[PDB]
């Protein structure tokens, strides 16, 4: 059964060699992963590659009212 | 008796209103006595409410 083992070994390194991919994909698989995860990255988030986020906020008003005392 | 005449008592009465005027106008009430101790608790009161108008 070595002998059927090494003729596995053959053929993956025939899908080794590739030069444009996906041969037997075609378009379906194309189609669908770039839709997979663009209706998971509309459920994930808009973030960008490269832009680092940076913000501030702003804290209450400490106000101050009045009493007549003494 | 029957007297006569009047020339008497009657100039030697109004000299006693002159005198019953002034022994019975020294006399003293014992009712004013009950009203000098309203006035005393209410002002000290009005006191108390002008320390606590001190404190409010």
Known sequence: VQKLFVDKIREYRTKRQTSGGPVDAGPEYQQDLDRELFKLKQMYGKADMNTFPNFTFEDPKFEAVEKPQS | ?56
């Open chain 2, 1 to 56: 008796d029957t007297s006569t005449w009047f020339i008497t008592i009657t100039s030697m009465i109004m000299t006693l209103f002159i005198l019953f005027q002034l022994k019975i106008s020294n006399y003293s009430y014992p009712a004013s006595p009950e009203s000098i101790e309203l006035k005393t608790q209410k002002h000290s009161t009005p006191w108390e409410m002008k320390w606590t108008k001190i404190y409010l």
